[PDB]
Amino acid sequence: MKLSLMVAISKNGVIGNGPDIPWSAKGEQLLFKAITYNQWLLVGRKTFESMGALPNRKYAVVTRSSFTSDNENVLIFPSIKDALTNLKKITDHVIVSGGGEIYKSLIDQVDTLHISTIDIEPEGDVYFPEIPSNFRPVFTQDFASNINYSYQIWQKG
Amino acid sequence: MKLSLMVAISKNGVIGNGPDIPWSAKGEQLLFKAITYNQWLLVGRKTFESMGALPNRKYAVVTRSSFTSDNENVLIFPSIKDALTNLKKITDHVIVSGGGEIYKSLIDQVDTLHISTIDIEPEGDVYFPEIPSNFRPVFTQDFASNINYSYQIWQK
Ligand SMILES: COc1cc(Cc2cnc(N)nc2N)cc(OC)c1OC
Ligand SMILES: COc1cc(Cc2cnc(N)nc2N)cc(OC)c1OC
C-alpha cells in the first residue's frame, strides 16, 4: 500500500490547511482537490470536522475519542497502526491529509510528499515537521496569485 | 524559461483534450485546472477556439493563419520560435497545452511532461508522439472513476 502525504504550509512551516486561515492563496486548493479525487484520506478528528465529508473523498479518521459517523465513506480507527492494517485490505493508496501530530507520526513511513508553500511568514502554533533526509524534490512549480505559492512533490529513495 | 507540457491521452495515445470527447474521465480535468492556474499556456488555433478563454490563464496562440482574438489574455505569434523568444521576456514558465502538431514540434524541447492516460482504446486520427527516451517518470498516481485514469509526471 502506497502512502502519500499532502499539506499546505507557510514559508516558516505553519500548517495552512485549516478553514479560516487568512493567508490562503487563491488557486492552491485546486492541487488538493485534483490529487485527492476518489482517494482514501487519513486525517485526525479536527481535520475531518473542519473539512467535512467532501464529494469524491473517502476518510480514515484516527481518534481514540468517542467520534461517530453514519457516512459509509467515513471509517473511524483508534490508532494509525490500526488504520493502516485495515486500509491495506481496502485500497492500494492512502493520502495523509493532516493534523500536525498525524503528520509528525507518519512522515518517516510515507513514499511521496505533496507540499504547497505559500510565500508568507505568519504567526502560528502548529508546524509541519522537518522533511527527513531520504526524501528528495522531483518536481517544482511556482504560481503567482494574491499571495504567491510553490507546489513541490518529494520521493523517498 | 522552463517548458512544461500537459496532455490527456487514451491508452493507445489518441489525444482526448477536446470539448465533446465521449471517453472523458470525471476528475481528470481537475489536474489540468490545478497545474495551469495563472500559467501561460502555448496552444494552436483549434485548441484555443475549443478551450475558449477559461479565466486565470494567459494564452500564447501560434498560427500562420492571421487568426484574430478580441481578448485581453491572448498573444498571437506566427511560429513556435517567435512565441518562445517573446514569452522568455514576460514569464519563467510556459505550459504547452495542445494541438497534436504543437505537441509534435515541442515535446523534444520541453523539460516536464504532465500525462493523464485514460484507461480505454477509442479510434482517432490525432495521436500524441512517442515519449523521447531521455524522459524518466518521477511520479505516478492511479484514479478510479467512470473510466480509470493514471496521472504521470516525467522529467528530462
Ligand atoms: C478542502 O478543505 C480542507 C482541506 C484540508 C487538508 C489539506 C488542505 N490543503 C492541502 N494542500 N493539503 C491538505 N492536506 C484541511 C481542512 O481543514 C483543516 C480543509 O477544510 C477547509
Ligand atoms: C479545460 O478545457 C480544455 C482543455 C484543453 C487542454 C487540455 C485538457 N486536458 C489536459 N489534461 N491537458 C490539456 N492540455 C483542451 C480543450 O479543448 C480542445 C479544452 O476544452 C474543453
Numbering used by the authors:
A (entry chain A): 1 to 157
B (entry chain D): 1 to 156
Quoted from the paper:
TMP is a selective inhibitor of bacterial dihydrofolate reductase (DHFR), which catalyzes the NADPH-dependent reduction of dihydrofolate (DHF) to tetrahydrofolate (THF), a necessary step for the recycling of reduced folate cofactors. Expectedly, all three enzymes form the stereotypical DHFR fold with an eight-stranded β-sheet, four α-helices (B, C, E, and F) and three catalytic loops (the Met20, F-G, and G-H loops).
The crystal structure of DfrA1:TMP, determined to 2.2 Å, shows the antifolate interactions in the active site more closely resemble the binding mode observed in DfrA5 than in EcDHFR. Similarly, electrostatic interactions between Glu28DfrA1 and the diaminopyrimidine ring dictate the ligand binding mode. Additionally, critical hydrophobic contacts are lost through the L28Q substitution. Excitingly, there are structural differences that rationalize the higher levels of TMP-resistance observed with DfrA1 compared to DfrA5. In DfrA1, a bridging water molecule facilitates the interaction between Glu28 and TMP, representing a loss of direct H-bond interactions. Another pronounced difference between the DfrA1:TMP and DfrA5:NADPH:TMP complexes is seen in the Met20 loop. The direct effect on TMP binding is through interactions with Met16DfrA1 that result in a 2 Å push and ~90° rotation of the trimethoxyphenyl group as compared to the DfrA5:NADPH:TMP structure, correlating with a >3-fold increase in resistance between the two enzymes. Moreover, binding of TMP reorganizes DfrA1 into a conformation similar to the occluded conformation of EcDHFR that involves a notable shift of the Met20 loop. Of the ~500 structures of DHFR from various organisms available in the PDB, this is the first isoform of DHFR evolutionarily distinct from EcDHFR reported in the occluded state.
